[PDB]
């Protein structure tokens, strides 16, 4: 859980 | 979100949109596994509402999103609608979500987890960008 395949960018 | 920014498509895979039969987005939610969604008790979700997973742009017709039906609504019996305390509802999907690159679960903390004041976190959603 909590480790998206598409990394978020902020 | 007022003053936020557009997310990288598919980067917040647990984010779901609660839509009524009209197709109107009224609340957000988070997948905790393929059969359960956590949302706010005040959203007032009923079994006639739909959970939309894998969506980014609510105006696109070419996104492969999953429209999932709700079997049951579990409103926390401790939710106080007068103070909005214990504002949480669990939704059991009648149809399990299919996990992929754009659809997955967020983690839940331990009851003893500590998240210190000053820590920078992230909030996501399709709410009003200007009031």
């Amino acid at each position: 859980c909590g480790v998206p395949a598409i990394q978020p960018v902020l | 979100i007022v003053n936020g920014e557009e997310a990288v498509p598919g980067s917040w895979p647990w984010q779901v949109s609660l839509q009524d039969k009209t197709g109107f987005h009224f609340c957000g939610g988070s997948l905790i596994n393929e059969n359960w969604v956590v949302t706010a008790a005040h959203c007032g979700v009923t079994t006639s509402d739909v959970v939309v997973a894998g969506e980014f742009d609510q105006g696109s017709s070419s996104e492969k999103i999953q429209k999932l039906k709700i079997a049951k609504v579990f409103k926390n019996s401790k939710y106080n609608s007068l103070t909005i305390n214990n504002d949480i509802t669990l939704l059991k999907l009648s149809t399990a979500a299919s996990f992929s690159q754009t659809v997955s679960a967020v983690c839940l903390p331990s009851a003893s987890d500590d998240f210190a004041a000053g820590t920078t976190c992230v909030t996501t959603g399709w709410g009003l960008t200007r009031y």
Binding site: G2 | V106, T123, W126
Partner: protein
């Protein structure tokens, strides 16, 4: 409301510090965040407030309530998941 999903970073505050804004409306199963130039708003309710813990994003709050005007200088109020997680675990186990 926007067609595309929005995101925003914001700091968590302490409840004692948040009571300065909301007074006694701030209960134990609530956690405040924001007042940093950004704000959750109508339509955001029910969504996530996530913080990275040991490399993974974990559900810390659920968008609950806040200023009726979505003021970016007032903190938003979220349901505190750490106070509600035992109920979640009990509910998943029974159904």
């Amino acid at each position: 409301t926007p067609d595309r999903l929005q995101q925003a970073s914001l700091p968590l505050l302490s409840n004692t510090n948040c009571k300065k804004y909301w007074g006694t409306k701030i209960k134990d199963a609530m956690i405040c965040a924001g007042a940093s130039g950004v704000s959750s708003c109508m339509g955001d309710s029910g969504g996530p407030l996530v913080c990275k813990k040991n490399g993974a994003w974990t559900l810390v709050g659920i968008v609950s309530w806040g200023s009726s005007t979505c003021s970016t200088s007032t903190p938003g109020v979220y349901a505190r998941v750490t106070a509600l997680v035992n109920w979640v675990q009990q509910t998943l186990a029974a159904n």
